[PDB]
Symmetry: C2
Subunit: 131 residues, 2 copies
Amino acid sequence: SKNVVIYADGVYDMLHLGHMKQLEQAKKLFENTTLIVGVTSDNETKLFKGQVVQTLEERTETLKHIRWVDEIISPCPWVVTPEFLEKYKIDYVAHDDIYAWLKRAGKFKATQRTEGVSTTDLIVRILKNYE
Amino acid sequence: SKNVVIYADGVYDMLHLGHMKQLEQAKKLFENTTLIVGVTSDNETKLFKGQVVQTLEERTETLKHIRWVDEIISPCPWVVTPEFLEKYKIDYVAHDDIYAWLKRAGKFKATQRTEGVSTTDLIVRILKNYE
């Protein structure tokens, strides 16, 4: 009944069914949720992850089409802080420890992955037809 | 105010932002809509289109994550017929003539494409980094 605010951040480069299923899990952690998604900036992703295929605008615009996504913070901070959680009134952080302080506060929620549905998975499936 | 039933069929192989934007247009043709999406069977697609990368289950499961999609008919008929439109109480068929009878009945609604956002577009973008 009481609306719970859930926050899930990530790069969301080349969104595939694995991401979508993870967004669905996060959205359905509780009966009544607001799922906020954070999309990392191009510069920080390149710098910390190393690379990024799609721009922030492309990655955000794709997520805007996903049913479970209620709100998008784009770009989002690379590091979640308690101040950030306070400002957006976030109840839980969904992710698949740097995250130890979130568990200690009961704010951490795990979401699981699905394999075999990515862009790479589909290119392999196509090229197996020819090589 | 009055709810309008919109129907958009297709293969929806390798769903990308172009498809999603087209589903959004179809969903927002009127203030109050139900967007029904038809997903073609593997056999008919292979036979008439020629090929298909993702199975019906994969293509349907992906569309299930798309916000604009209210209902899915999977598989859908390869050919829309008036009987089909009657059975599901469809008011309009959204598409991007075989379709002449739909225009004559005022049931035809065009939706436009977006280019440069496909899987192929993104592989090219990656490989341009290496070749």
